[PDB]
């Protein structure tokens, strides 16, 4: 187990190096928007994002130490949360806009093209502002994303579980290590830690709301035949 053997700085380098690239969408500036093309853009992007997420998860220290059965469950449980925190992160320096992709920045109005999409956009925009408000750093973001992966479905599966909880503590240490190095006092360190993890509750909320919205779009025949994405969707309504 090299996982529980990593120092704080090595954990950081491990996570930073595993970061998936920022992908482009099929957005054509001249094509008029409809409910089907906008949903088509997002699902087409997400589907390609899922492949990178699966390969990124494998590089998250400790993850491959889990049985394939556990790996599948953790990812089926956290995929949309991970996509979302990724989306919120990319949109940090773009007030009022959600940077789904470098060539696809959307504002809430553009979000009205899809029935009931605007309230999800509003939640992601608000979470994005929160990120600006506290000046979230890159190193902290990668830690949050790995925490989401390891924590989301950790109780919905007992030794393999004990393993996960230890990596989670290693990550909490790394978050502390990062803050101490930034000059924060002890009090400031435990307060920012809480501020960071409290974000996960909001990430989980938007994930549940967007999962319901997505399932509803799937029953309107506006979601392409993206097998991986669809398979990831069905795992939520056993």
């Amino acid at each position: 187990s090299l996982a529980l053997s990593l120092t704080a700085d090595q954990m950081v380098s491990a996570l930073l190096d595993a970061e998936p690239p920022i992908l482009y969408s099929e957005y054509d500036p001249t094509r008029p928007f409809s409910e089907a093309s906008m949903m088509g853009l997002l699902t087409n992007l997400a589907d390609r994002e899922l492949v990178h997420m699966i390969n990124w998860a494998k590089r998250v220290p400790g993850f491959v130490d889990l049985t394939l059965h556990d790996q599948v469950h953790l990812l089926e449980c956290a995929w949309l949360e991970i996509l979302m925190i990724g989306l919120v992160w990319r949109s940090m320096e773009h007030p009022g806009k959600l940077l789904f992709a470098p060539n696809l920045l959307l504002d809430r109005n553009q979000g009205k093209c899809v029935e009931g999409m605007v309230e999800i956009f509003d939640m992601l925009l608000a979470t994005s502002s929160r990120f600006r408000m506290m000046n979230l750093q890159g190193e902290e973001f990668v830690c949050l994303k790995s925490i989401i992966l390891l924590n989301s479905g950790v109780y919905t599966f007992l030794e393999e579980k004990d393993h996960i909880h230890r990596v989670l503590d290693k990550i909490t240490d790394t978050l502390i290590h990062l803050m101490a190095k930034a000059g924060l006092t002890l009090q400031q360190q435990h307060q920012r830690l809480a501020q960071l993890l409290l974000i996960l509750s909001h990430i989980r909320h938007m994930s549940n709301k967007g999962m319901e919205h997505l399932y509803s779009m799937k029953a309107k025949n506006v979601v392409p035949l993206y097998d991986l994405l669809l398979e990831m969707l069905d795992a939520h309504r056993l």
Binding site: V51, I54, L68, V72, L75, E76, L228, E231, M232, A235
Partner: peptide, 11 residues
Amino acid sequence: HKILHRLLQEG
């Protein structure tokens, strides 16, 4: 034998 399962297994 989901698609995810396979992509996770493959080296």
